[model samples]
Target: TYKIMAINAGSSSLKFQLLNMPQGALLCQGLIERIGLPEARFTLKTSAQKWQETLPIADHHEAVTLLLEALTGRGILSSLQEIDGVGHRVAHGGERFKDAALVCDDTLREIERLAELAPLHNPVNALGIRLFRQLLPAVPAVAVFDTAFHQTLAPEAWLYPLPWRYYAELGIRRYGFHGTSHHYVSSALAEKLGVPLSALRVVSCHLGNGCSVCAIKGGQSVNTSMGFTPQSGVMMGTRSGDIDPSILPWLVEKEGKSAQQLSQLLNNESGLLGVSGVSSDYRDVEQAADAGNERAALALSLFAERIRATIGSYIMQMGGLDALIFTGGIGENSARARAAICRNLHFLGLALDDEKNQRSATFIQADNALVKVAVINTNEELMIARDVMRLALPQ
Candidate 1:
């Protein structure tokens, strides 16, 4: 077995997991938040123990160094050489990468250039890649991209209805996010059902702070809700999701809002938080709705409806559906949201057992249901580690 480290670097935070590859055993996982601040916090957890620290992290380099030191300092590893491979989660690969690749100077440069498409994520991701390469020069590192899985989408599914010239010149086409999560859950479902993925048509709903729906046929992504950017997917914590384009111009004319201001409104000031006026968290919105708040109730209804609509469209796109999967934070935990989304899908041969769903069981579908409905706990880090083992290690 090999030791694989998976790294997901956000704007100001770093999340990591070390796993025993092939066997897929978890060794340790950790996170460092507020990387540039004096109050940066580090938390590490293994099967038996947890460790936390708060101090200045300065930057990604410092964060990586601190993590490395802690790994040995805590006796988690005797030496840094125990690590066999490293995997970095890059947010956007544009149209260039379709699969995870070994990190080379050329791949690193391409990841840097793709930062324009994911300014908030790719630069930091690239920084993590560079830091790990410097710290463990002998270990092979892999770049697992969020957009790579969706690269299977055909032009008809990916192209926007806008001018053809814009797509040709500016590369403005659909590039779905949350690909790793979608891929992991779908593959898990296929395994649990004892069916070859080649014969399955599944819709994967990744519901969290940022939500997305993906339609997979024969293990390939045929269509996904998110388009061009993550902000365009199903309604998320703060994102507005798909909206009438004309509304932007109208608001610009009536409210004198600039494009940048409108962009902020759509991406940060909308969705559940906007409609409920409670909090961005779905838990908060559900609580307020339970307490007889009309706006919160409306927000919950809107969120479920939008997701159901996306799933329905994808069902038609894939011709039929064999399994419907719920994953991610809210998807795996919120029984109420799952019930609401599946309430009307019975017409499509999907039915949920209340007891099973309330308990968040693995298979929530009723015994008589035709379509298998599942609740999967997504593990993107495991997916990344597997990719690292597949691409970086010799077979």
Candidate 2:
């Protein structure tokens, strides 16, 4: 009975969804990208049609203002008051926020201070909150963090093998991202399988340009691949994941690059693009490999091997896995990648039906397979809207 909006503001883009909270229905969803550029693009979608527009967006402030105006001017919303609440997808909470928080001065300031922990994410997220508060002052807003769900990680699981001062004072520990996607997919898989989530040990893989793998036991996150920042997980479209600590120093000395330059190189110049010497897009890499590119073939192989190794490790950590779920771009659409990852996992009774694997299906595991495999399309916006309803709307 309530209308809630979920907003995810990135450095150069802002994505939004307006949903009917209790029913979990999407009313409208839109994206605005290329902020601060000379020509920005906006696309809004409803059940009926898509509305596209282009203009120069100086910053996030103007983006939010224009977004609201478009909603009303386009007749999707009759009045501004129709929106009951707003939920923000904040990238990092820095162990300070365990769950979604109602936005206030303190919450805003703390999110600002936590920017240091997630230099690439938090500042932009906080700016979205600030702009929303100023433009829609009357609407209630909730901050939903990507790291909050992994707050359950035990000390041994989260703490790095580093000095106590670095962890205690600097907060250098594992804080997994994609909590919304992992939480949504895991719960949805349990429901679809008609199993009690508490009785199942599951491995959730969210493989997109930015990737992460989470191990869930009794419906709780016990361990995950990414640590401290999003850059530490399995190698992604551009990020070089889990490199030797000595490589940074060597690269700096060899290339004569500064700390900032090297950081950009590892985070943006490496991974599939660096290895394949092709585009960062997996589709491109897959195409090049199919066309007889050795490096491209190697890149795809390394990517799947990293994910397979992580899945094996999680199964060992959790004792056993009842279900292995995949969501995200590569996991959902890349059959070639999925097949390669499951090729060796047949030993664990995880056999993929070649025909079914080629198509998108809810369950792709073979009939004789002991473990279940599912491809659950993640709905982070719905998760965020539900959080807003639970925290912002009174019963």
On lDDT, the leading prediction is 1
TM-score of each: 0.97, 0.97
Off by over 4 Å in 2: none
Candidate 1 local lDDT, 193-289, one digit each (tens): 9998888999999999999999999899999999998999789999999998999989998999987899899999999999999999999999999
The TM-score of candidate 2 is 0.97
Q: Kindly list the per-residue Cα lDDT of model 2 for residues 1-395, writing each as its tens digit.
A: 78899999999999999898799989899999999986799899998989888988888988898889988988988899999999999999988998999999999999999988888789999999989999999999999999998998899999999999999899899999999899889999989988878889999999999889999999899999999988887989999888898988888889899978988888899999999999899999989999999999999999998998888889999998889898999898887788888886666788888888889688998999998989888999998988898898866
> In model 1, what are the clashing residue pairs, if there are any?
none
Residue 96 displacement (Å), model 1: 0.7
Which candidate gets the maximum TM-score versus the true structure?
1
* Model 1, CA-based lDDT: 0.93
Q: For each of the candidates, give the backbone clash count.
A: 0, 0
